[PDB]
Amino acid sequence: RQFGHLTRVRHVITYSLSPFEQRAFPHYFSKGIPNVLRRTRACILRVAPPFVVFYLVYTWGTQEFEKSKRKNPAA
Amino acid sequence: ADLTEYLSRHYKAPRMVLAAAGGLEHRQLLDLAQKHFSGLSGTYDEDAVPTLTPCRFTGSEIRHREDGLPLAHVAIAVEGPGWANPDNV
Structure with missing residues (x-):
């Protein structure tokens, strides 16, 4: 596909x-x-x-990670 | 009306030139010009004198694509030299 056999176009004027x-x-x-x-x-x-x-999800992941890290018994 | 105003505004005596060439005499042409073209015009209507303002060679391109044609026409042009300069030569 080189440049010149692409399509057939009438009715067009380009200004620049x-x-x-x-x-x-x-x-x-x-x-x-x-x-x-x-x-x-x-x-x-x-x-x-x-x-x-x-x-x-990121906030929930870091928060639940630290909460499962921390333990708190009482005796 | 517009053709009347065009005729009155441009076909005026100081900007028209009677030129002839061939088997004739400048005496005879001066005689016939004096007999006919005298009293033609020479005064504008409402002092409405047209004047060439200079124009601007912009420099750009237009392509009109129409593929239902056998050949392609291309023109490419650059600046104007005018008339007076020897750059014309």
């Missing part, structure tokens, strides 16, 4: 500008931070709820 004339960082503090906020809100409902389950 030189890399020199458009600037390096177009509004990198006025678009990118609301953009990554939208990215974060679109993912943490499907990523975050397992890891808090793991954090609870």
Whole structure:
């Protein structure tokens, strides 16, 4: 698969500008931070709820380990 | 209306040039130009003079993909030299 026998495409026009004339960082503090906020809100409902389950498991494991370590009779 | 305004705004006497070449005399063409083209125009309407502002060679690309064609056409172009400089030569 080299470059030129891929597909058959009509009806398409691509416009693009030189890399020199458009600037390096177009509004990198006025678009990118609301953009990554939208990215974060679109993912943490499907990523975050397992890891808090793991954090609870970690706390429970260390806590029950020390409680099975400690004994307390009375005589 | 718009054709009227275009005709009145551009087809004006100081920017038109009567050129002839061949078996004729510059006497005779000056005579016939004085007989016909005199009283043509020369005054703009509401002082609305068009003027060439300089333009910007941006530098970019457009590709129009249409695979239902037998051959492919490519053009690539760079900056303008203008007219006056010997860089044209």
